Amino acid sequence: EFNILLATDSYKVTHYKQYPPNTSKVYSYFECREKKKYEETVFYGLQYILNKYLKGKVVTKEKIQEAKDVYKEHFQDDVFNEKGWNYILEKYDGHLPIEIKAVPEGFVIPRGNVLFTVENTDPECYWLTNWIETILVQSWYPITVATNSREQKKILAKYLLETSGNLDGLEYKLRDFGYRGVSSQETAGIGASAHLVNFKGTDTVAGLALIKKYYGTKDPVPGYSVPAAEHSTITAWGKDHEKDAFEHIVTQFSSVPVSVVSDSYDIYNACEKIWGEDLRHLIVSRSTQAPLIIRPDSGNPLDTVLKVLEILGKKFPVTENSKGYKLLPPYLRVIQGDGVDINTLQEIVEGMKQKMWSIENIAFGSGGGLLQKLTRDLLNCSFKCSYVVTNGLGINVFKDPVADPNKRSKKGRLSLHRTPAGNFVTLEEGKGDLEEYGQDLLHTVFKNGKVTKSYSFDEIRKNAQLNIELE
Amino acid sequence: EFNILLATDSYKVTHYKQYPPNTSKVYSYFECREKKYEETVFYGLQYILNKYLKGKVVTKEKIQEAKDVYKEHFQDDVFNEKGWNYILEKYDGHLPIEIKAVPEGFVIPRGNVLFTVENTDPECYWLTNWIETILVQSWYPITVATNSREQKKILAKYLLETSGNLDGLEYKLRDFGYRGVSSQETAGIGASAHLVNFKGTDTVAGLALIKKYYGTKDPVPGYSVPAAEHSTITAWGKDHEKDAFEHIVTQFSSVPVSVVSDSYDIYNACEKIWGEDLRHLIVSRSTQAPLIIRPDSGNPLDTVLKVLEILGKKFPVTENSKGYKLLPPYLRVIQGDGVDINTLQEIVEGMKQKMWSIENIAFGSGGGLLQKLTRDLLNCSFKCSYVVTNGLGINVFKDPVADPNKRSKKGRLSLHRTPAGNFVTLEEGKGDLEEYGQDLLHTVFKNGKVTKSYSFDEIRKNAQLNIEL
């Protein structure tokens, strides 16, 4: 079972003996630090952490004993603060005397603004604020996944609109194929749920479980999949029966959309000779709600997509849409699911536009690119202390490393506000109290063991909308 | 609670309908596919087998739940209720699977079979690839352990040249990645992977996994020192950094203590605060209890060099037997910012050119050690190589025209020792010819049971560097 006393960076165990004596309050905050592009970030995932790890009776005699033993061996010394934890146990029945305030989930906020704040509500637990930093800062992952996915949605939005005239199908243009390519089951589910803030397509079904348990949606599920082949279900037929494999698969799923990987031996041959001639009569008969979706999976992504399009355009009846771009018949589409991240996605859709193919023709699939190749440096997710009370006096604290001003931190008690022009600003040094800027956008989400405000996954989806969607 | 019927890539739900009719056997394997990183460390499968695959992993309740999810998820009924119900009734919910695998901690060149998977019941031909997803996640502990080991090789080399030995090598790279990983589960997994090669971690999640899944003779696999963070310094007030430093080293006077010294001005902290104001509280410290100064900003090499030069002029420096400068024993440095395998190598080389022993320094790495890695680094891949259909065995593979690097192996595989003492993977069942001795793979899983396992102690012995051996 989970033990919050063991869920921190080892060294923080020793911190109680390091803060200034007579310190009654430690107040800290999380931002996505500016860097001298990712200009705005989606706030998502804290609620998952509050419910699964922070809430309820999280301290027990047994959890205290257990930590005392591990820490003794781990440190070869008895540094563990047993009294402080016992105090939380006896006084508050093992509930954390902490208040967390946060911007609403889904909100899209410029870099360098306070996203949430954490402080102790009992003077005895000044050390507790930064003990849970480690667990709280992991919010970086769903924040960064939601944000990176959204930036990609924007690109798809841009090219789809220009090549086709509208935004139909946008929410199915970037699918999550990342399940096998992430570092754990837990990560898979978290990361998958973060992608669902922006899209509806995923094959990482753990993602749905998390959303239902921790956020909730009107509809039965927030994510959807279509029947799709893998290399094993094609190659299993044998090197000389790829066409037998192809034909069996599209007949099994003649009524639904169906993705078929087509590069097991030669993608170009399969497209021009197998889909294009031998099996042509099985494609052109299909419904518009049941297209075949050809899936190349190797070679240079831009080059291979353009070659596949060019091939199909000459085997199938292409039309020119109202904006002047080429469109395949409704029963035929293409998905690129190899080597896709934000960079090559941009490369592909630009390359398509240059060659006069609509973005309607294509969907993208992303795995490690979407959920794994991302770190805390991407948005500079950082948890820093900015206010303390020592000897009954509050003082405004911060770091300001001389060789890196980008790592300067904010001062004092903080609040987030709407500017007159409708943008965002963070006020420092308790300046929010002057109330010249209207109301604090941060809300109490956690206080003394209790989750105090929650958001449905729907509200979240609505908060994270593109402006282009909003228009 | 974990439901294996829901821990697979969505589209695999449809695959039992996609194989050729009368397929009785599906046999697949995992490799770190050949294209830096010429050899990988095998680690992490035992965790996966025990946490996820062993025992009764299928129940009436767990079937029902999957049926409902997939019906919505697909907006249609495609879920294989019948295959899963067979497993429940016939084998009491235990998986009819056989997994063979190289020993954990083993160090193997790329492009060799690491593990194989196949169904032990004709009715369950579809099960082999169902569980690809959970098994493929083994890429992560493999890749962390490998990248971690590659870094140790670099540390070993320079420590040896600048100091003549390897004392303390196992504490020269600490895990600081606990906040910079994507999940709690990832933290433990990854921490245990780094501990294969090193003993320093601040990610406590890792000890518990090791104890539960592998086991060590010692009470714990990893260790940490008292250390400050910016909030334990900055809380004193911008004009009291000295009071903070004093309190901290006094509070931890007879044990090692790491103090971040770049809150405001690293170069002032080193030269004026540590080097003058509090100097008398350093030079009186025991060799067992050094102060370790932790810069945390600037160009990592440039900052390490200047910190070293600052300290050298303020403290008594010696020249070890190799001709390298060495700090007094109660004074060391740790760089824990921007450290990854590339910068690690930049720093130790820059140190060597300036005649500073690697004895002086230790590194902490986070995102670079545990987060910024993908399945692509080692080309970790799981592929079908052999099936039986209508009673006939077929060797199967892919060979894409545009990418010969993506070609998978053919037929039944086995791993062997060459006449020169190396590894080879034999394909097409050729291992049965018995020209290359015994298969080095061992059965580790069969029909719901783990059939072979290793202590963390033996894994560590397998993963040792050549220079160590």
Numbering used by the authors:
A (entry chain A): 8 to 43, 53 to 487
B (entry chain B): 8 to 42, 53 to 486
What's the publication's text?
NAMPT functions as a homo-dimeric enzyme that catalyzes the rate limiting step in the primary salvage pathway for NAD synthesis, the transfer of a phosphoribosyl residue from 5-phosphoribosyl-1-pyrophosphate (PRPP) to nicotinamide (NAM) to produce nicotinamide mononucleotide (NMN). Crystal structures of NAMPT in numerous ligand-bound forms have been reported. These structures consistently display a NAMPT homo-dimer with two essentially identical active sites at the dimer interface. Typical NAMPT inhibitors were found to occupy the portion of active site responsible for NAM binding and a tunnel-shaped cavity extending from the NAM binding site. Furthermore, we determine the crystal structures of six NAMPT mutants in the apo form and in complex with various inhibitors and present a definitive model to explain the differential effects of the mutations on various structural classes of NAMPT inhibitors.
H191 and G217 together with D219 and Y188 form one side of the tunnel wall surrounding the cavity commonly occupied by NAMPT inhibitors. A previously published in silico model predicted that H191R would protrude its side chain into the tunnel and sterically block inhibitors like APO866 from binding. When tested across a panel of structurally diverse inhibitors, H191R reduced potency across the compound families, but remained more sensitive to APO866 and GMX1778 than series A inhibitors. To reconcile the discrepancy, we determined the crystal structure of NAMPT-H191R. The R191 side chain indeed occupied part of the volume inside the tunnel region, but did not completely block the tunnel passage, thus imposing a more stringent limit on the size of linker moieties in the inhibitor molecules. The bi-aryl sulfone group of series A compounds exceeded the available space, whereas the more flexible and narrower linker of APO866 can fit through the altered tunnel. The H191R and all G217 mutant NAMPT proteins exhibited at least 100- fold increases in GNE-618 IC50 compared to wild-type.
